Write a protein that binds this ligand. Structure first.
Ligand SMILES: O=C(Nc1ccc(I)cc1)NC1CCCCC1
Ligand SMILES: O=C(Nc1ccc(I)cc1)NC1CCCCC1
Lengths: 490, 541
């Protein structure tokens, strides 16, 4: 079947002659100063989330969702209030049936037959619900499953849970994806192009992903950040997904990555953004902050701490010591781990992406002994409760284009990176910063960030309990909160 | 060849120096006491660690304040206790803008074929108005091929280090390169290697004289920065199943969609795009459904206005924007106004170029009204499918130079005679002179961009004559309230100004814009103007 609700006050609230038909669309708001004080009433009404969530559910579930409300056209000033609130609901329903458009209001039987026509279905297999009920007269007539909404849910979730089946109580933020998205495509150097995704309106914040991921990762913070009130630019890190991913090694020097990261802003014409890296990106994100502070309004790292280099300590040597940094050494040899990971990506990803309470992880340190970062990993990885089968399939497809050379090439510029950063040795980071640490991150544990403020005074902190290395995907609702609260505050 | 420029004193101004001088004013402080940090010949210390890029600038406050306290009363001269240099630099910088004329001359020899660059003693700024710094660096970004900043490589002017590194970077000789600096004590080293010195003393021109000579001569009031076309972001939203919308993006928020007309491409706004970005907005110059890189089906209903506008919305939705400034020209302006009429929420403001708001009379078949305006013939000609396609397509090379001509250009189109002769380019020579308003490449693009779509789809915009009327016949009771602008072109043959005299009956407060000596090709013809107005508009309301 299909499920429908009205907005008047069921999917948004607090709820609410020339007035009776401006609904039909023959007149605007401003041009209607007869029979004013509410150009705010509408303002002070936002989304009814448990209700809005009920939708994505059913849509994920197999229905077609809609809005068939009695509208009007706001040339108001608290107009945008509407735009956004609408631009928000937008993607989650397939049909927008508004009175101010199809000329026919609620409750004239029109809209109902019109609705049913619009999708083409029987009065029975389509449910409806209005805060009004005086509107559910017709729908009950024809023969459709009616539902009131006199509270802010109740039987809504409950009696509507009848539908097919139910929904939860503490939801994940909404996903977002993966072609209902703008696909920008800046080209920096000759052969080098950078793909990315865009959502929401300014100011800008670049979401730089890590190894071995894709922009797809922020799939939960992207919408949220947009709504937050920012223009998100979730990029595919050089070498990954739809951006150019050469074979050359020097190609992935940090010095390089950061420089290009700038040419990106230039080309796109932005003079400053909020860089927010995680994993190997956070490294860059901080270097970003260290080498081009102008173009950075603020920085946030996820799990990754600011790890300066000791001028009197070969960088390699230091990698050979941290027991857990083995895999990392394993990698250093070209074609090798490529060959290992590539062989069967299906396994590769479910092995990598597992939680903080998940068996079968990676072989961080035995990796050289065992001679393979997956050898203690099953042969038929169990789907991590932290991803879906499609969630994986995307990562695969996205990786079939690049292979693994390039993403791995990020490790392989060990010496030089050190060589280069050995200049931000005299400097200190001043532009707003945030270090969000994950309690149970096996490599890149919190402990490694305790000195940071020696470098980054004012460094603000974020800490998420029960975390894996897969922060966004694992504790998103949290990540969002913090991330937003951060941007809001500073 | 090549010529690179310092960014202070020549490209960015008024210089940071002057600031120093007039604080060496605000306080006893004898000639050069404060500037000397910046200006020396033999550089050392706190600023030396800045220029070299060892420590940011904020670091550099504590250190250099207290570095001055040294030479203060301690060593001649009286320097105040509760004293500083911070916001008397983070101010003098935020107060320095681009030397319009320089940049102009800079783009010149890039066009003329030099490598342009800037070799400046920069520094990293983690300051407040640090942003001010980015924009300026953001802008100049394109016009110079090279960026040798002291604070990046690690050498400083005039330490020979840099020059020699610049040379090794281009890979030229001290001769075939020119240089200029507000300093001269900086110039010393290059007039030694063997480069062409230019004491960029003044605000310039004095410069641009014994400089004009070398290289060439610079136009009086050059052509406005025209974003161009390879190195621009290429967004790609997909609204309906088979339908995708290509567009271009430049600059940071708020957003304003530049909707082009027939028979063009997003490429048209190539002069307002940069300008609007700089203006301070995020430009989204779209390829109108059916044109260029966006999906251009064959179906007719496909281009219904009702449709085009609806999708235009799904566009915002997908891209996640709840409101924009729609600015149409030609057939787009029609949509742009309908935009305003049917989705006022999503419109913060509207601007039409040449196109007036032309409501439909409910008691007057729309077709009939087209048959009357003498000039609306071509328009009728079009109505027949495959026909004008076949005509225009045959040789696009001619097609475009014919269409795009000025207000003082012979060989235009056959607006009204059309049908009779059975064509619009029938009398248009079959070998057109290049309109002084375009370049050969300017044309080649339009071509290439059109080879992908053919002409069906762009023309399909005409062909929904009745329905469009049918639909708009609802905004008959409404009035447009969201900010509006009607900019009229004095000599637009069809879509003349006269046709907009009634508009305010519909659009009270409608603000006005009028450009003299104009063709239908407004942006491409009188851009510098268009820009001005357009900006002044967005600035004001
Ligand atoms: O290797 C890194 N991160 C990293 C390595 C070196 C630096 I300098 C910064 C981050 N991530 C791994 C963690 C375990 C699962 C695969 C990805
Ligand atoms: O036809 C239009 N514009 C137009 C037509 C109908 C409407 I309703 C609005 C604009 N433009 C022509 C002008 C002459 C050169 C080719 C393009």
């Amino acid at each position: 079947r299909v499920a429908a609700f009205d907005l008047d006050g069921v999917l948004a609230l607090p709820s609410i002659g020339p007035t009776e038909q401006l609904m039909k669309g023959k007149i605007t708001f401003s041009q209607w100063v007869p029979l004013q004080i509410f150009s705010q009433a509408m303002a002070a009404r936002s989304i009814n989330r448990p209700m809005l969530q009920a939708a994505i559910a059913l849509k994920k579930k197999g229905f077609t969702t809609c809005i068939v409300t009695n509208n009007w056209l706001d040339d108001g000033d608290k107009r945008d209030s509407l735009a956004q609130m609408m631009c928000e609901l937008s993607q989650h329903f397939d049909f927008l049936i508004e009175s101010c458009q199809v000329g026919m209001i609620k409750p004239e039987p029109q809209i109902y037959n019109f609705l049913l026509d619009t999708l083409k279905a029987k009065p029975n297999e389509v449910v409806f619900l209005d805060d009004f009920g005086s509107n559910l007269k017709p729908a009950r007539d024809m023969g459709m499953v009616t539902i009131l909404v006199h509270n802010t849910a109740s039987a809504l979730r409950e009696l509507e849970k009848v539908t097919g089946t139910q929904f939860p109580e503490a939801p994940l933020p909404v996903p977002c994806n993966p072609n209902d998205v703008s696909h920008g495509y800046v080209t920096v150097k000759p052969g080098i192009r950078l793909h990315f995704v865009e959502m929401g309106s300014g100011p800008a914040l670049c979401l730089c992903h890590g190894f071995p991921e894709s922009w797809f990762s922020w799939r939960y913070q992207i919408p949220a950040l947009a709504q937050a009130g920012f223009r998100v630019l979730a990029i595919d890190m050089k070498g990954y997904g739809d951006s150019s991913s050469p074979p050359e090694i020097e190609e992935y020097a940090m010095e390089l990555l950061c420089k290009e990261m700038v040419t990106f802003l230039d080309k796109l014409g932005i003079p400053q953004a909020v860089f927010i890296g995680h994993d190997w990106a956070g490294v860059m994100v901080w270097n970003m902050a260290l080498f081009y502070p102008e173009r950075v309004r603020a920085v946030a790292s996820l799990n990754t701490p600011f790890m300066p280099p000791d001028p009197d300590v070969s960088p390699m040597k230091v990698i050979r010591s941290i027991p857990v940094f083995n895999y990392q050494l394993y990698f250093q040899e070209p074609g090798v781990a490529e060959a290992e990971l590539e062989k069967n990506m299906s396994r590769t990803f479910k092995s990598f992406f597992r939680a903080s309470d998940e068996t079968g992880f990676i072989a961080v340190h035995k990796a050289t002994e065992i001679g393979g970062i997956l050898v203690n990993t099953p042969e038929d990885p169990n789907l991590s409760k932290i991803t879906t089968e499609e969630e994986i399939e995307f990562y695969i497809q996205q990786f079939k284009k690049t292979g693994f050379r390039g993403p791995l090439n990020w490790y392989r510029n060990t010496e030089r990176n050190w060589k280069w950063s050995c200049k931000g040795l005299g400097r200190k980071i001043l532009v707003p910063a945030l270090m969000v640490t994950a309690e149970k991150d096996i490599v890149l544990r919190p402990e490694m960030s305790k000195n940071m403020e020696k470098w980054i005074p004012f460094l603000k902190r974020g800490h998420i309990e029960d975390c894996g290395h897969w922060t966004q995907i694992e504790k998103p609702t949290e990540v969002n909160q913090i991330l937003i609260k951060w941007l809001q505050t500073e």
